[PDB]
């Protein structure tokens, strides 16, 4: 049986191992400073795949292991190890949310393919308290044509906020605003004054477009804490560290 | 109308390295016949038609009546 | 691939197996279709592609550069009546221009206007032009894989770099300099099979430029301790100008992105690696990337030594360990830039020659053989056969010193290739008489072909016959500049010694592209001498040249037709390979011609530009050999 | 296949009222011949016109250099004509034949043509039929020639104008009441490309040149030829525009197709075998050139219909009894000759059907070994095979005991093999019965054909009827054919005196 | 004609099939390659694709090929190391195996 030769490959493991410890450690022009790496398992991470003596005559896919190793790399970066471009957290989360697994990733791809088949926005990313107001309209009583009246009243007051607002504050981020996001702030033009903030990301347009993706501005998030008695009646925001 | 396209043909899936020196940003695609399921409208339509030719599972039976109690 | 069709008809009753074709007088036939045209009562078929200067008359057993525009004389007098028989003709430049050729340069016109330059088409007011290469057009057709034919190569140099006319300039020759973006060839890559950047050098070189060697050695020696790397002595190889090579964006086909041109000799050293390589060399790698995106990988190469940096060759001779350290620097470079298909050496004088700064002894040749063998050994010791490199050196064609080069032992020691310098035979500033600086072919009366009439074929035959070396290991090419000579008399080849001669930038060394601008043309689908400057060709040696009487100024130069002659010969030989020296200053038409000479075939019916009409000869004449004239 | 047509010439089709040459020449000082034609008025007044005629050829060649021109080969050959007022200026005559009569052309080759008294003579191989109009008024094509639209009503439900829409595949299927795939399969446009055995090389092999861009076998050369005029521009699927599309119009073909489909619905089998059959029957009498059905065709139809319904005979077998048999196959499908022979491969070389230039009397050359292999494929004793060999050679009129390569004799042989075993008859039983029937030997070897005259010896069809029926009667009698032949005295023996 | 004639203009998208990236999910190589360039946008103390000594765009058919042989593939990966070990001291003659039997640190046991 092949099992007979199936030892040789473990021997070959050992061979490589010694070629590492014996030759690489003193002859590594790579990694010449760095040492440690005393044990076989180490480089399976540091520069190799999860390359283990486990064999058991188990059939395995190049595709799959390459992927898994890619995952290794990703995670070695996800957790702070050897300095990696640890991307912004939302991207990292997407990695664990979808690229964590084929079917996970695959489904993500599926959606990103779909022009529309079943996106059916009975709910959606988009929101304003309009949405809960709407729901309230939906859930009150029994449905009727008049219900939209209430929705438009919602609209009314919200658009009151839209129209007559001290659109005067905000912040400009880095120099990247030729390409990306920054933030904005405004206030009621009448006391007792109220304040809100939103943002916009210039990446949301085509490479050659000047029209922009309808995602556009974030909402005018109402300020929570009391704000009054400010010397000039003007206030300053800034954002850092995703706060 | 049941307008139909051709197959998600093989063309020739080509085994070749992956780089923008190979893949192209332009500044092509790599199928298998599976991107479908959309046709369900047509499908249900056709079924309905066949169940006009007959009936959606079997054909039923009628009901009767009564006298003076009526 | 290209494809074309024609058709013929007959009465329904008659079916010729042959392609019937309309009987007609000859007149400016052309193309691929059958022609049986009649002339001088004879009837003529060019069983090969037809060209507007080609004539069936001479063609009876001629009419193409290789064989008969064959004929019969079946025509009767009444055929000679129904058709008005031709008996002589001359093709003219057409009135239209079938293709654009080039674009003017504001700054070059300004240059001509400069009160120092004072350049004029006739050169009367100004013997030099310093014309910017930017005048040039892309000029590359496209071609089939054609794998069997010998490889194609071109030389490349730092003179691509700068023309401060791009930077205003206006006062000095380099401000009126030359240079081009490799983007040019990038537009349609795989233009060649191999390339060779110009000869670089080593620490300890002796020639004029050695102050550069000093500077770069200083930068290195300063960086090395800070890098935590060993210091270097003489014999270590030099890049000459890493800031040019990498600290660049203009002329190097890449966005100014990441072009830290501020970096230089004192600072580049960490970047001195292909991965890090910005600028020129990195771009070369990227071009190779595009190339492979197509396929047919280029032999990327360069060399070291050469005409102006050979000086230390003798000095390094007989210093075996420093020679070792040098080749160590070679393999180190390989590791730093494993992209390279190969690189080579440009020793030029086994026996002394060229610039006198190249001090030399006799033993030089022997020592050179020995060290060469040792290089081979070291190389083999480094390389994996799957990725092996194989080395070449040029040769000067100096009938004796080439022998002194001991090619036999070099071959026996695995030097795989040789590139014969086939140009500048005419040392115009010092040569006794005018001659063709690049003639492959032996003129009649070979009695004086020793320092003159130096038909490269002679050395070729020495190598083949007198040394048994297979042609595979030897390569030939052409250069894209002629010679210019004052007061020459075409009858005697005597000429005005020392008198200043034409060059845009290099007197006595007229620059091809600018010749196309000024003296020669093709806009009217022909080889067209222009501006009163004579287009001319000699039957003795198949020689080709140009002249102007008002200054008795002569120009010896290769041509599309003449490089055709060359490549055709080389192809018939099935040489090891073909290349062009100074490829930096041809639009590429000569490269397309080189493809033709290689028999390298185009892949489409469309063109960047035509090429056939470029093969009409110039003013025919017979020039006596130097021996013939003196005898 | 096989046939060279590089010197073929277009021929005036024996026209009583049209003029032009009818014979070919090796050479003449003639750019074009000329043709003169009787024009005809609608009210049958008579008119005439004249035209130029054109043998024409065309060819491809890459631009290159240092390579000689015209490395000639047989290649594309084509025809056209032209009219000009210089040919005739009588014009302006709606009242005198804007519409006019047909024009018709033969297509022939002129070559050595005699069994022994050889001389270069012409024989046709194709016909071409045309009708032409003087568009004096530029009238409607159905103002002129107006019957077709009525026909398109009564068997196309639709107008000539509507026919334009038919080019759309869906319009086609819809008027057809039938699935487009059926048409596509009729057109073989699928991946089901034709196939052919390695063991045959067709002569005149103008195939495989860098310019022989046509696929081989061609459809207008195999599988569905009838759906086209044996003509290069076979209709096919073409790229979508306003949806997927059909190659091109040929109302002529379209009727032929409509007809075929109608038949096919009664023929049950797929189209390709049907084509093979109808083609073979067309081939069975060269008198026709219209590739049309005939009474004999009908006879063959009923013949197969009955035969196969009775005894599961395959169309291939049937058509093979009628004519040569396929070395071709569809994709995956297997050639008939190979299945008959190279099915078994008990030898160093699979016998190529291009082989057989030999002589069957002696077992010597490997060709004799082939003869053995062929006989074994025919499941026969080689000695009885050699009983047949002279008989068939004689039917061919071949001489010197020689074997000849051609499948044709092999086919006659195979018929002779098959016909008896179709009823359990021995080869020689078939011989006996054939003699009993025809009063002659070898008719089953004789190549089938059709004739106007009553000649039961050549009506193989009713011959077959009588054969099988009367052999069944012999079965009812439970007797050997030889015994019966002696009874009829068609076989005879001496009566030498003795003790 | 008919009043208000029906007109479901399935306006001509010339509908044609589209590749799933899940098939050939390895195209994930694209994403990660981009992310690799992002990683490459860091201080020069990081090995990036040269941390990836193991792989190359082996963009080939492998619908099924599974075996434990990838272990051996890891030996071929060791091929790289031995090649530089040759670049430390030349050899090309299966010496990595042959020398496998010769030295310290390990026993350096018998080779294949």
Swiss-Prot record, chain A:
Post-translational modification: The isolated toxin complex includes 3 peptides starting between residues 768 and 778 of this protein, which might be physiologically relevant.
Organism for this UniProt entry: Yersinia entomophaga
Quaternary structure annotation from Swiss-Prot or TrEMBL: Semipurified toxin complex consists of at least YenA1-YenA2-YenB-YenC1-YenC2-Chi1-Chi2. The Yen-TC:K9 subcomplex is about 26 nm tall and 22 nm in diameter with 5-fold symmetry and 5 copies of YenA1, YenA2, Chi1 and Chi2; the chitinase subunits may be solvent accessible on the exterior the complex. The Yen-TC:K9 subcomplex has no insecticidal activity. The native complex with additional YenB, YenC1 and YenC2 subunits is 16 nm taller and is insecticidal; the toxicity-conferring subunits are present at about 1 copy each.
Residues of the full protein shown: 2 to 244 of 1364
Function: Part of an orally active toxin complex (TC) with strong insecticidal effects on larvae of the Coleoptera Costelytra zealandica, Acrossidius tasmania and Adoryphorus couloni and some Lepidoptera larvae. The TC has an endochitinase activity.
Compartment(s) where it occurs, according to its Swiss-Prot or TrEMBL record: Secreted
Signal peptide: none
Protein name per Swiss-Prot or TrEMBL: Toxin subunit YenA2
Phenotype caused by lack of the gene: Cells with a disrupted yenA1-yenA2-chi2-yenB-yenC1-yenC2 locus are no longer pathogenic in C.zealandica larvae.
Curated annotation (Swiss-Prot), chain C:
Protein's name according to its UniProt entry: Chitinase 2
PANTHER family named in the record: CHITINASE, CHITINASE 12-RELATED
Organism: Yersinia entomophaga
Signal peptide start-end: none
Binding site for chitin: 274-275, 305-308, 349, 421-424, 581
Chief subcellular location: secreted
GO BP field: chitin catabolic process; polysaccharide catabolic process
Keywords for this protein: Carbohydrate metabolism, Chitin degradation, Glycosidase, Hydrolase, Polysaccharide degradation, Secreted, Virulence
EC code: 3.2.1.14
Catalytic activity, reaction form: Random endo-hydrolysis of N-acetyl-beta-D-glucosaminide (1->4)-beta-linkages in chitin and chitodextrins
Stated family: Belongs to the glycosyl hydrolase 18 family.
Subunit structure and binding partners: Semipurified toxin complex consists of at least YenA1-YenA2-YenB-YenC1-YenC2-Chi1-Chi2. The Yen-TC:K9 subcomplex is about 26 nm tall and 22 nm in diameter with 5-fold symmetry and 5 copies of YenA1, YenA2, Chi1 and Chi2; the chitinase subunits may be solvent accessible on the exterior the complex. The Yen-TC:K9 subcomplex has no insecticidal activity. The native complex with additional YenB, YenC1 and YenC2 subunits is 16 nm taller and is insecticidal; the toxicity-conferring subunits are present at about 1 copy each.
Function (record text): Part of an orally active toxin complex (TC) with strong insecticidal effects on larvae of the Coleoptera Costelytra zealandica, Acrossidius tasmania and Adoryphorus couloni and some Lepidoptera larvae. The TC has an endochitinase activity. This subunit might aid infection by degradation of the larval peritrophic membrane.
Domain GH18: from-to ranges: 150-601
Summary of pH dependence: Optimum pH is 5.0, in the intact toxin complex optimum pH is pH 4.0 to pH 8.0.
Active site: 348
Keyword GTP-binding: no
Recorded GO CC terms: extracellular region
Annotated SUPFAM superfamilies: (Trans)glycosidases, Chitinase insertion domain
Curated annotation (Swiss-Prot), chain D:
Subcellular location: Secreted
Phenotype upon loss of function: Cells with a disrupted yenA1-yenA2-chi2-yenB-yenC1-yenC2 locus are no longer pathogenic in C.zealandica larvae.
Subunit organization: Semipurified toxin complex consists of at least YenA1, YenA2, YenB, YenC1, YenC2, Chi1 and Chi2. The Yen-TC:K9 subcomplex is about 26 nm tall and 22 nm in diameter with 5-fold symmetry and 5 copies of YenA1, YenA2, Chi1 and Chi2; the chitinase subunits may be solvent accessible on the exterior the complex. The Yen-TC:K9 subcomplex has no insecticidal activity. The native complex with additional YenB, YenC1 and YenC2 subunits is 16 nm taller and is insecticidal; the toxicity-conferring subunits are present at about 1 copy each.
UniProt function note: Part of an orally active toxin complex (TC) with strong insecticidal effects on larvae of the Coleoptera Costelytra zealandica, Acrossidius tasmania and Adoryphorus couloni and some Lepidoptera larvae. The TC has an endochitinase activity.
Protein name stated in the entry: Toxin subunit YenA1
Origin organism lineage: Bacteria, Pseudomonadati, Pseudomonadota, Gammaproteobacteria, Enterobacterales
